[PDB]
Structure 1
Amino acid sequence: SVPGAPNRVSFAKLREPLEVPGLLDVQTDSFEWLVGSDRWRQAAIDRGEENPVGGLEEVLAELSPIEDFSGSMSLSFSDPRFDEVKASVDECKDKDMTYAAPLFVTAEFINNNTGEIKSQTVFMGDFPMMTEKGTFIINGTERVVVSQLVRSPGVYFDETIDKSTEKTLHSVKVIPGRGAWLEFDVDKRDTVGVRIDRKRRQPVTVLLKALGWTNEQIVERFGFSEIMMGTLEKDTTSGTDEALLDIYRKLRPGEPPTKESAQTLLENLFFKEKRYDLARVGRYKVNKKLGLNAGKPITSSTLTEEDVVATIEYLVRLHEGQTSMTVPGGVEVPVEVDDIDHFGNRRLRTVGELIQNQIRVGLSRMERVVRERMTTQDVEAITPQTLINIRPVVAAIKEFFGTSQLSQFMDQNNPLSGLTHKRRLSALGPGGLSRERAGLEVRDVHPSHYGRMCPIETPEGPNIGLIGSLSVYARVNPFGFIETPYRKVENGVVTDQIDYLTADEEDRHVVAQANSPTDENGRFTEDRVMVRKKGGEVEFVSADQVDYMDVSPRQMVSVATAMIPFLEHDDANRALMGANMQRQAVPLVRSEAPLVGTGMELRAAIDAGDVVVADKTGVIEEVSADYITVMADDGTRQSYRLRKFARSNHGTCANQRPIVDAGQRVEAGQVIADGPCTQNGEMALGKNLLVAIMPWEGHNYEDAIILSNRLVEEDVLTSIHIEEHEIDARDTKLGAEEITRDIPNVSDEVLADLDERGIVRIGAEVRDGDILVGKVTPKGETELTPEERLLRAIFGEKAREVRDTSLKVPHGESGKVIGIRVFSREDDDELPAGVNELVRVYVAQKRKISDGDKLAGRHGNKGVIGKILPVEDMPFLPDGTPVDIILNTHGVPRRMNIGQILETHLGWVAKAGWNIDVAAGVPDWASKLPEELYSAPADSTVATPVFDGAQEGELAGLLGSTLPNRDGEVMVDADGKSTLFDGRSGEPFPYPVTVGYMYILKLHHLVDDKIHARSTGPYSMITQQPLGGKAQFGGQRFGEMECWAMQAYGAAYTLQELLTIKSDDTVGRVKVYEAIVKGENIPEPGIPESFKVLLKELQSLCLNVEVLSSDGAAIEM
């Protein structure tokens, strides 16, 4: 499909009826809806939806008209419009600006007395805009807003077990989009009550009467249930007014018992749409569940007395065990409890809806000021400009993009990491679930996740289960529910019709498995087929009972999980580990696509956006490392600037490079420049290299890994890492700090590489302790000691009042300076208050693979390099080729991740071409293979989808059809094993060893940034203990369990020195340091300050405490 797609032969045997949709739609569609772009308008009206309203249009219409308390004044908003962005994305990133566009809305002031209308256009501020990649730019940093999973504004019934009596208690709560809650429950004594606005419980009959129902009507409607009649009998309230007064005094205990307010508050609490709203999704859910207004259009989202009575009837029917209910005027609906974890109840707040809510809050704040100062300015001399205060809305938008929990720095470790970050589904966040209520129950795989949330992919951190990844084929219902496609099946023949179903509606049909065998016409060729039914149960049903089928086997998995070959053979835990480790790969200096992979790796590469794609067909006029110029067929000229050695958010290098030649023809959408971690426009997260599966002298013992020195000499696993140091000069109580080259008391050996401005020159190499930016700060009173004055005298030191605070390379860091960015308010640049100049320095280094670095495959097999062997020591094949990596045999079987062996065998088959004989007909094991796989040359990449790829029999047959080597001798036998020689001894190994090619990748857990040490350093002022963390140069923790272990050893002295000398004991610490440096034996400790102060306090309490020596001897000190 992609014009520049390399030919990767595929093992798939099933034809996909639906292509994978745009993977970033989950963001772009939402933002288009928010801004009401014409594209979204057309795509929505195509659905038969008349006059779609954008998010901003919806919010503005809901906000207006704002009417004065007297009705003589009014204000209205409409017609939101957007102009061109101030600057391009790259310029904004380069200048620490925010990618935003002006927002204008037409505002009309109306005076109802004289009829004056004042209509103008009001600037509402700079609204941040989304880029083509589905991300935002704020203050120069790239950020992503992740979708949030939240409970929908429906009505939810449930049953629980009473803690005291162990009885069954049924309850219901009405959850609105905006407003107060309403809930009912049957007590353990069979008493039906209602809680209004979470307040104290009271009989439901009180609420029923307050709505105007008389005792006769209540008896008639609820006579079927004895508990309701008993509650009414025991209800000591009569008449509508008395019940209204009771409710009013319940909700407003401190207000006078006036009848007018008592009647008004109830109407204004639920039933009038000013302060209560179900948001057009809560209304839909309530109508569907209770069977109200069947077939009617959604006219209003307000609550009505009819549905409250219906909810009470539903609760009463549920308590008494009835299964079906019919409401007067409605349609029959089953009576059952609600599983809040079911995606028929959970909905998705996309970026658009979150920004809409923030804008709603801002405009709500604005409305108060507008209506307040409507009553303070002279009438008829009041334009919209005079009272439209846009500060609150801009402040709200800035706060959301700067401090909200959903807007996060994009995970820019590699293209796959960023792509999978944009498609997150986060249950945690404001309006989600409570911080301390994230129990193990919610973070579990419900059956409804199938086809809309991947069960394998999830972070390893504390958010396991709380954060998910959207599936490849899923999409978002305009109500926010996640839909997924299915093929319609009729009379047992699979049809090309595809319908999108939500989890709520999927349970009403029987869904067959994706890869069920079928004939050319589509009819099933089996009597019984595996299907999923209402409860998520998998069973076997006749061929005439199926209703739908999955579009493809890859429906359940996500983008990352779709890139693990032979995913059948890996356990769920190891698949999870591999999927998450794919997100931690660090881009290498030269990327290389895997020999054996999946067809997804192409699309995922393009949809990530890091690859440059030609917009229009044309000829490559000029190509260079920095930019590509294309002349379109229509005469238009395009220029694409490539980003070179740009530092990602996580310190990885984002270097791009072109893959086209001058004069070449490129089709529309063709990839013209490789991304940071792709080759020819497809994912290249790692390197494919030769692996032998055998233990080796114990160097690969306990999941360790052995590497050949070749990988160090050829820069196979080398990666470039860039660090950004920062400093600034601020105003102080003694004055302003200064950046200078004349820093005091340093030899010329130290500042040789500093420029005139005092900043390290570009291109110079720096090592830990080297000065980067020379900075000096004013000091206070000197008051030299006699010794210091003598030193001034004997060196002729003229008085100066500055102290050195120059920026220096942190401990254990080095590299070459590649860039400097300097800002200063004198150049009108925006800076923090009380700051004059700011400097940022970029230091780049070329890290090779070393001992301790973490490597891993795609199947969850991970380890650390325990040894790097000389090339001559590695076991080598009979032709002299030395293997690159050795993996221990004992780690494969018990981990249940045998898919790595499949990858090894298929990679060997791919590296050396194969040729299946057809002289006497196709071999019986080659019947299912497509003809395209009957032959292939060396280094021929192959594809094996996750759930439809190479079979065991096909792979076993292919292993014996590989082409010979240069000399004509086959290295690997039909079993995938080869006879390896010993590099050291030279004798052949007694038994053949499994050999092949494995795709392994370098994780971002390098030892260079994990080693830490501390003899003495800074200390915390609050608690006097050593600081914590590598950045602060802190010490290691010594917990209570370590103290228990030391006590169990009987090592009293070691524990004492750990708790006192190496801890908050200043005098002892200094004494021990002095003794060590001077060679004196370590002084003994004793009598800490805490005991001294405790003893002093005890004495202050007139308690004659004293310390005595021996078993009854005199005092000491």
Structure 2
Amino acid sequence: MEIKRFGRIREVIPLPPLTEIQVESYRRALQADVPPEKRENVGIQAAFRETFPIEELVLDFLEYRLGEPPFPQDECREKDLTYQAPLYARLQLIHKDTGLIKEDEVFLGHIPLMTEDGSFIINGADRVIVSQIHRSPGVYFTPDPARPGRYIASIIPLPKRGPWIDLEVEPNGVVSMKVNKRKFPLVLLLRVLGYDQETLARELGAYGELVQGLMDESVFAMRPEEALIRLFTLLRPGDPPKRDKAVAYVYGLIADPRRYDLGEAGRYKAEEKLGIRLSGRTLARFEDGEFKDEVFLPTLRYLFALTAGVPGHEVDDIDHLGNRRIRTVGELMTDQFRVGLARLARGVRERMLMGSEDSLTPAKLVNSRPLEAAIREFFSRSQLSQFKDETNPLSSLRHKRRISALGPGGLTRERAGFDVRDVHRTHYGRICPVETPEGANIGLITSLAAYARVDELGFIRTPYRRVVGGVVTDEVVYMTATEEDRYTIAQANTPLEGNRIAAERVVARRKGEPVIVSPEEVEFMDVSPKQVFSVNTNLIPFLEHDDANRALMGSNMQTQAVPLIRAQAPVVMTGLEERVVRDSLAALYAEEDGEVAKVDGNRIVVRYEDGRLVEYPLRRFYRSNQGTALDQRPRVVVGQRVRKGDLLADGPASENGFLALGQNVLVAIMPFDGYNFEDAIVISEELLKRDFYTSIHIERYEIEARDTKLGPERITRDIPHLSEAALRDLDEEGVVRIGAEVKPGDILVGRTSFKGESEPTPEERLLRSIFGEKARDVKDTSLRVPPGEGGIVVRTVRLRRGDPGVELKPGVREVVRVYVAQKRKLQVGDKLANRHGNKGVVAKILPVEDMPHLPDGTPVDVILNPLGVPSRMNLGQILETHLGLAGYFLGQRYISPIFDGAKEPEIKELLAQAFEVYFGKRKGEGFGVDKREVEVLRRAEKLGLVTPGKTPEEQLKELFLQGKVVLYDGRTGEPIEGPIVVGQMFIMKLYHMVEDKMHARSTGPYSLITQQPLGGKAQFGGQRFGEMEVWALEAYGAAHTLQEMLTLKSDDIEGRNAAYEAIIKGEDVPEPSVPESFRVLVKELQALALDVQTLDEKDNPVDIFEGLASK
């Protein structure tokens, strides 16, 4: 079909690789493809160099290598394995006395490998490591909140790599240093570095009143040894001040690169702030037997200069993105790697004492368990390690680009106020101002902007075009926020003829402040409007017409869109939807130019230029983390000539290579009989008839058979007391057959368990005796379909013990997995949304004859209430509908870029050409204006919509240019009294579906200690009737309703039993008894040595334990 694209802005560079923030970070961390001699000291390599040599015999690090993965990715997901590589290190043990050297390559366990798309496979499940924003290491000067004319100097290193130091000028006038919560006069620390009054007086004298607060006679009297011992006694009271002990502690606090690490970014920021050059990442050095200063004197000089008001000295904005940096996958993982390595080193030193001091190898010295555990802990249990969101391809791409201020080494949610959550001016071009969570995490979880990239230091940079004279170059410079602040940057839409700025006054930013400026003053210019927003936000057409609060929901909800069997790309696109599919890695493309040899549902064979025959297998109906079906479909035919980068297969949610999150439906904006009320949505049954909004879902079920002290669990078709009706669809072995339809209550995998030893009650003795049937030894433990679930069985995996290639966890004889698939039609309670933040649940499905319809007989698909628009201020959905109407009749789709889009005149032009197709056709077919069309026209000229005196055709065209048409009520045949807005809208079916959420319980499982119902649908849980619900019952004065909630419907054991028995017998429910959790409370207070006594009116004890707990 035709695709007409609007907008004149030419973007000189394409979007960067969208997952590069993940992929490149990890590549740098492993340095796997670099030959060892060529490795830089970074990532894993830097961790080894930091941990070694291990001194005590001396064990030294030579080099590491990474092997190949024991199993490929597909296999790991199948077998619940982690995709990982064996890590080895060549280590040499040396005896410094003897000279003896034994060298060996020790196996350190495995390290997880990142897949092509930037994710991990950890125990079979796909995971994402979310980048973490935090304070850049460095030296900052912030204002002291208590004392206005004073400031605090904070020296910050990398996390866990050293203490923070705070410099303050106390009211008494002496300059104090705060380390690990202890304060002392800084003069003492200066003396340890070897500074003398002569050097300090001349250096800081320029600032009058402050230098005297630094002068302390007693400190200068003592030599560097006495000052160092004095400081150690101040910092570590009670620890004997052995001279070697003090040097060791202070060295570790200041000069040790192993215990103190400023960043590489920390070093640059300090050097840049204080105007010096650092020999390393430490605040000082240990050289020639003494300590030699690096940092302290320059920060002190700047600190005094700030207090005195010397020109050129500023306080630092700590939310500026120059002072805030990103810790990506490589850095986070390497940190945990460094931790595991330190633990392993502890074991080495401990092993270097015991055993024989003579015969020892590196293999005998190293226990790798601490390292394996540190890495295993990071990937499974870290907060930044998240279950991948792969609801649709855009979901995971977005997940990889998210930025969190939470996690280890970061903000808590209550401790995070407005400042961090704010959109800083420096977020421009770096962090999307739109895409952030609604609710408690707002401003804490953010998203990388589309053109943004994280530099080697960890700062987010954004591209700008150089502007020389009035000429805009094509050379793009990626800038940090700090460097961006130097220039005057014109907006990307400023008019150009050729490379020249064509306006007399241009719109630019200087340090974020908007200003009108001459082309002579323009140093750079934005690459595109796309650079201000995230990828999801960049997918919203007419975004300039939507209030940001709704665009937020629009961005976020594209993440929740379900892949549809009929999915289509929107008729109004933004031009990013092709790139998103390509970077997502869902779609399949041709490597080189070639011709297609074979095309199957399962595979595509391509013959390239090289002559080599390449076969691409297709992933068919695979279950994602969220259970949506990932399946690839061949888009080419046998004998087709393809070029390099031509589409071979569509992934999920893509149509011919374009991102397809939904369907294009015909919408009428109008109230409908209250089924539209308060965001509810009315849809036509035609949508189900033609399988729009239908999605495939797969659920995985699992069961283990294990050894017991009572005998084996067995997976079997022989299950006590079950009819052949019940076993019909089970195979010989007891597993449900592929292709069977399973419904709630149905057996998936049959299983028997040996009955726990019990004496049958005398009732069972008599019952067994009456019927003459031996009580079986085993019980029916079979796995069944839970309430509300079921579908068609598409797969079964069975793994026994003692069969080739498989070993289970101890005690487990066999494991069975049953994959059940369901084709889900859209239904009442399902949630729909568009890209502008319009969201609603389907409240009514009308038959086609009730649907409002056009004069030519076409019923609309969806009816959206206009009451949702004005308060929300998202008008983009309206413009999308208007342009969607033109495209419906012209048979075309559009690309309207964000902020450089189709404007109203152009949309009107298309609407005019469309009206010719919608109407001119009719006049030739021999039909004139309808009577009811005249009536609608009458009310319309009363509304000022049409010009009086024009022909009926002319007036209908005037309305059509306003995007309104005459609409017939399918119930009556009479028109809607006014012309109504109708058009094509792009609407998605979100992941929140009633089938998943509907739940009810009569009685069910109870908790161990409290005896209260369990929680959640998966546990067959009860609803929580919480503190606030109780208040409601209290305010109503419903005492008996409330008492039921508190006793018979919860933890009153005697009461709940009696209530059930009464209801099945038709009696009224009995009076409640004591709730079991009150008995727990009494006993818990007795465990605390408090005697809690229930008393009667005579103040005599009442026993709520009924004699059972008293001797």
TM over 0.5: yes
Alpha-carbon distance change, 264 to 196 in structure 1, aligned in 2, over 3 angstroms = farther
Q: Which secondary structure does the structure 2 equivalent of 1:821 belong to?
A: strand
Distance (Å, rounded) in 1 between the aligned partners of 2:1078 and 2:560: 50
Distance (Å, rounded) in 1 between the aligned partners of 2:50 and 2:406: 28
Q: Which secondary structure does the structure 1 equivalent of 2:521 belong to?
A: coil
Distance (Å, rounded) in 2 between the aligned partners of 1:209 and 1:701: 76
Say yes or no: does 1:695 pair with 2:676: no
Aligned with residue 229 of structure 1, among 205, 208, 212:
212
Q: Greater helix percent: which structure? A: 2
2:372 equivalent in structure 1? 394
Distance (Å, rounded) in 1 between the aligned partners of 2:1039 and 2:586: 60
Tell me the TM-score normalized by structure 2: 0.90
2:716 equivalent in structure 1? 740
TM-superposed CA distance for 1:1036, in Å, is 2.3
Residue range with higher mean Cα deviation, 377-386 or 597-606: 377-386
- Kindly report which structure 2 residues correspond to 1:248-259, keeping only aligned pairs within 5 A, or say none: 248-259=232-243
Tell me the TM-score normalized by structure 1: 0.89
Q: Are the equivalent residues in 2 in contact too, given 1:613–1:670 (CA < 8 A)? A: yes
Aligned with residue 607 of structure 2, among 631, 645, 649:
631
Q: Which secondary structure does the structure 2 equivalent of 1:732 belong to?
A: coil
Give the aligned residue type for 1:533. Answer: R
Say yes or no: does 1:61 pair with 2:49: yes
Distance (Å, rounded) in 2 between the aligned partners of 1:184 and 1:89: 49
Distance (Å, rounded) in 1 between the aligned partners of 2:140 and 2:1082: 59
- Kindly report which structure 2 residues correspond to 1:366-377, keeping only aligned pairs within 5 A, or say none: 366-376=344-354
TM-superposed CA distance for 1:782, in Å, is 2.7
Distance (Å, rounded) in 1 between the aligned partners of 2:1021 and 2:124: 31
TM-superposed CA distance for 1:202, in Å, is 1.2
Give the aligned residue type for 2:1067. Answer: E
Distance (Å, rounded) in 2 between the aligned partners of 1:546 and 1:353: 37
Give the aligned residue type for 1:144. Answer: V
Q: Which secondary structure does the structure 2 equivalent of 1:84 belong to?
A: coil
Deviations 1:789-808 (A, max 9, x none): 12112222224322222111
Alpha-carbon distance change, 40 to 597 in structure 1, aligned in 2, over 3 angstroms = farther
Q: Are the equivalent residues in 2 in contact too, given 1:222–1:229 (CA < 8 A)? A: no
- Kindly report which structure 2 residues correspond to 1:237-252, keeping only aligned pairs within 5 A, or say none: 238-240=221-223, 241-252=225-236
1:269 equivalent in structure 2? 253
Q: Which secondary structure does the structure 2 equivalent of 1:826 belong to?
A: coil
2:930 equivalent in structure 1? none
Give the aligned residue type for 1:317. Answer: A
Aligned with residue 27 of structure 1, among 2, 6, 22:
22
Q: Are the equivalent residues in 2 in contact too, given 1:492–1:546 (CA < 8 A)? A: yes
Say yes or no: does 1:90 pair with 2:98: no
TM-superposed CA distance for 1:764, in Å, is 1.1
Q: Which secondary structure does the structure 2 equivalent of 1:876 belong to?
A: coil
Alpha-carbon distance change, 362 to 1087 in structure 1, aligned in 2, over 3 angstroms = closer
When the two chains are superposed, the root-mean-square deviation of aligned CA atoms in Å is 2.9
Alpha-carbon distance change, 785 to 32 in structure 1, aligned in 2, over 3 angstroms = closer
1:955 equivalent in structure 2? 907
User: Structure 2, unaligned stretches of length 5 or more?
Assistant: 286-291, 924-955, 1103-1111
1:523 equivalent in structure 2? 500
Deviations 1:561-599 (A, max 9, x none): 111000000011100001111100111112212111121
Give the aligned residue type for 1:982. Answer: D
Aligned with residue 381 of structure 2, among 385, 388, 403:
403
Deviations 1:767-821 (A, max 9, x none): 1111111222222333222221121122222243222221111111121111111
Say yes or no: does 1:708 pair with 2:684: yes
Give the aligned residue type for 2:893. Answer: T
Distance (Å, rounded) in 1 between the aligned partners of 2:83 and 2:1057: 54
Aligned with residue 321 of structure 1, among 309, 329, 339:
309
Give the aligned residue type for 1:631. Answer: R
Deviations 1:311-332 (A, max 9, x none): 12222222233332xxxxxxxx
TM-superposed CA distance for 1:297, in Å, is 8.3
Deviations 1:63-103 (A, max 9, x none): 33344x4xxx4433234333433332223222333222333
Residue range with higher mean Cα deviation, 791-800 or 571-580: 791-800
Q: Are the equivalent residues in 1 in contact too, given 2:398–2:536 (CA < 8 A)? A: yes
Distance (Å, rounded) in 2 between the aligned partners of 1:179 and 1:880: 73
Deviations 1:88-133 (A, max 9, x none): 2223222333222333433334444554544444433333222211
Aligned with residue 896 of structure 1, among 873, 876, 879:
873
Say yes or no: does 1:863 pair with 2:840: yes
2:953 equivalent in structure 1? none
TM-superposed CA distance for 1:1082, in Å, is 3.5
- Kindly report which structure 2 residues correspond to 1:794-813, keeping only aligned pairs within 5 A, or say none: 794-813=770-789
Residue range with higher mean Cα deviation, 1032-1041 or 706-715: 1032-1041
Alpha-carbon distance change, 997 to 283 in structure 1, aligned in 2, over 3 angstroms = same
TM-superposed CA distance for 1:383, in Å, is 3.6
User: Structure 1, unaligned stretches of length 5 or more?
Assistant: 1-5, 43-49, 325-334, 914-937, 1109-1117
Say yes or no: does 1:348 pair with 2:326: yes
- Kindly report which structure 2 residues correspond to 1:573-592, keeping only aligned pairs within 5 A, or say none: 573-592=549-568
Alpha-carbon distance change, 435 to 904 in structure 1, aligned in 2, over 3 angstroms = closer
TM-superposed CA distance for 1:365, in Å, is 2.1
Alpha-carbon distance change, 786 to 159 in structure 1, aligned in 2, over 3 angstroms = same
Distance (Å, rounded) in 2 between the aligned partners of 1:800 and 1:954: 80
Deviations 1:1061-1092 (A, max 9, x none): 33332223233323222222343447778999
TM-superposed CA distance for 1:824, in Å, is 2.8
TM-superposed CA distance for 1:990, in Å, is 2.5
2:448 equivalent in structure 1? 470
Distance (Å, rounded) in 1 between the aligned partners of 2:865 and 2:1095: 69
Give the aligned residue type for 2:30. Answer: V
The share of aligned pairs that are identical, in percent, is 53
- Kindly report which structure 2 residues correspond to 1:42-61, keeping only aligned pairs within 5 A, or say none: 52-53=40-41, 55-61=43-49
Distance (Å, rounded) in 1 between the aligned partners of 2:797 and 2:246: 66
Alpha-carbon distance change, 587 to 192 in structure 1, aligned in 2, over 3 angstroms = farther
Deviations 1:850-890 (A, max 9, x none): 11111111110011111111111111111111111111111
Give the aligned residue type for 1:487. Answer: R
2:949 equivalent in structure 1? none
Distance (Å, rounded) in 2 between the aligned partners of 1:1107 and 1:41: 79
TM-superposed CA distance for 1:517, in Å, is 1.1
Q: Which secondary structure does the structure 1 equivalent of 2:249 belong to?
A: helix
1:305 equivalent in structure 2? 293
1:511 equivalent in structure 2? 489
Deviations 1:22-44 (A, max 9, x none): 111112211221232558999xx
Distance (Å, rounded) in 2 between the aligned partners of 1:781 and 1:211: 77
Deviations 1:231-269 (A, max 9, x none): 535977842344322211122222223344334432342
1:78 equivalent in structure 2? 62
2:946 equivalent in structure 1? none
1:175 equivalent in structure 2? 156
Q: Which secondary structure does the structure 2 equivalent of 1:852 belong to?
A: coil
2:864 equivalent in structure 1? 887
Alpha-carbon distance change, 51 to 86 in structure 1, aligned in 2, over 3 angstroms = closer
1:922 equivalent in structure 2? none
1:618 equivalent in structure 2? 594
Alpha-carbon distance change, 671 to 1090 in structure 1, aligned in 2, over 3 angstroms = closer
Aligned with residue 205 of structure 1, among 187, 197, 204:
187
Distance (Å, rounded) in 2 between the aligned partners of 1:560 and 1:1057: 49
Aligned with residue 813 of structure 2, among 811, 832, 836:
836
TM-superposed CA distance for 1:188, in Å, is 5.7
Alpha-carbon distance change, 239 to 558 in structure 1, aligned in 2, over 3 angstroms = same
Give the aligned residue type for 2:913. Answer: S
Distance (Å, rounded) in 2 between the aligned partners of 1:1041 and 1:148: 36
1:567 equivalent in structure 2? 543
- Kindly report which structure 2 residues correspond to 1:725-874, keeping only aligned pairs within 5 A, or say none: 725-827=701-803, 828-874=805-851
Q: Are the equivalent residues in 1 in contact too, given 2:41–2:49 (CA < 8 A)? A: no
Deviations 1:966-1004 (A, max 9, x none): 971498722211111110111122221111110101011
Alpha-carbon distance change, 445 to 804 in structure 1, aligned in 2, over 3 angstroms = same
